[PDB]
Design a protein around this ligand. Structure first.
Ligand SMILES: Cc1cc2nc3c(=O)[nH]c(=O)nc-3n(C[C@H](O)[C@H](O)[C@H](O)COP(=O)(O)OP(=O)(O)OC[C@H]3O[C@@H](n4cnc5c(N)ncnc54)[C@H](O)[C@@H]3O)c2cc1C
Ligand SMILES: NC(=O)c1ccc[n+]([C@@H]2O[C@H](COP(=O)([O-])OP(=O)(O)OC[C@H]3O[C@@H](n4cnc5c(N)ncnc54)[C@H](O)[C@@H]3O)[C@@H](O)[C@H]2O)c1
Length: 271
């Protein structure tokens, strides 16, 4: 068995940045080396890590959700949106940690800790979900999972999707509804469409964008009732519905429409 990196969630492990790849205009994949090429991160599927640093004199701690897995020896991949300064009128300073990360050079290090999170995917449709941080996991096994992601909210979904597709005996069907501001904002589109091409029986894919291009074959606007009805499994099939995105997407676009369609709160989970 491979050596684990994250052995205690309170210990800080400095990892070195070894690669960075542009995902799109504001998003990148950051690859960090584990302590040896034979190490694994130690990451139950669905959990996240925290990065921390002193930035401009203040402690800054932020969670990020690896898109890699414990099958990936020697590295961890994060997919992170950079919030640039002098860009958005409401946030002229931009984002602290994301800009710090964008400024890192290959070879620089930052401290990781984890893993954390209330959901663990245990394979073959089986989810272990704690009601909160002080309770025991409730083990819920389903035949299908609805996934509603907005922007970088794609990251926990991709962890779960990849874990499922890797196991040919995992027959769980994932239905992803992925919302972004524009077509160019769709993160990891090639990766997602390769998954669709290779696993269409287990992976259903739909997009919505705030603003649609001329020739568009998907949906437009915030997540609405029609998209949930048409692009997630019906409530009669008792799927789990996983959500991840901006808090108002969850509060105003997801929850009320899940209610309208008939997905009970018990079947729903927000990362
Ligand atoms: C459990 C969990 C897991 C997460 N995993 C991921 C992940 O895998 N990948 C990821 O990218 N994020 C993830 N996030 C978000 C992440 O933790 C940070 O909140 C994010 O990176 C911003 O932090 P910051 O320090 O750069 O910005 P902050 O300084 O804390 O805040 C800036 C905020 O103002 C807004 N803002 C600032 N500048 C702009 C701009 N130019 N345009 C638009 N809005 C702007 C944004 O809302 C931004 O969050 C996750 C959040 C949670 C709770
Ligand atoms: N809790 C987690 O595990 C986790 C993991 C990754 C990301 N996230 C969160 O996901 C968000 C990603 O932000 P982003 O900058 O990439 O998103 P974004 O601003 O680019 O918005 C993406 C989509 O979210 C929806 N949305 C945004 N504002 C909305 C509103 N007021 N009402 C209804 N829908 C709205 C839209 O469909 C939009 O296209 C962040 O808030 C981040 O913290 C959470």
């Amino acid at each position: 068995t491979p050596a684990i990196t994250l052995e205690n969630p309170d210990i800080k492990y400095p990892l070195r940045l070894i690669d960075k790849e542009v995902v799109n205009h504001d998003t990148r994949r950051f690859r960090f080396a584990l302590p040896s090429p034979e190490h694994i991160l130690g990451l139950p599927v669905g959990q996240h890590i925290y990065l921390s640093a002193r930035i401009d004199g203040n402690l800054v701690i932020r969670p990020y959700t690896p898109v890699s897995s414990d099958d990936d020896k020697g590295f961890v991949d994060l997919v992170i949106k950079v919030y640039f300064k002098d860009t958005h009128p409401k946030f002229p300073a931009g984002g602290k940690m994301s800009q710090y990360l964008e400024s890192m050079k290959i070879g620089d290090t930052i401290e990781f800790r984890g893993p954390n999170g209330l959901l663990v995917y245990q394979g073959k449709g089986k989810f272990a979900i704690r009601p909160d941080k002080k309770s025991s996991p409730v083990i819920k096994t389903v035949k299908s999972v609805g996934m509603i992601a907005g922007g970088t909210g794609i990251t926990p979904m991709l962890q779960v999707i990849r874990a499922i597709m890797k196991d040919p005996d995992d027959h769980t069907v994932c239905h992803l509804l992925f919302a972004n501001q524009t077509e160019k904002d769709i993160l990891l589109r090639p990766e997602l469409e390769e998954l669709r091409n290779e696993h269409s029986a287990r992976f259903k894919l739909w997009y919505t964008v705030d603003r649609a291009p001329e020739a568009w074959d998907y949906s437009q606007g915030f997540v609405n009732e029609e998209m949930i009805r048409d692009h997630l499994p019906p409530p009669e099939e008792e799927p789990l519905v996983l959500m991840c995105g901006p808090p108002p997407m969850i509060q105003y676009a997801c929850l009320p429409n899940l209610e309208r369609v008939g997905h009970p709160k018990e079947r729903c989970f927000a990362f």
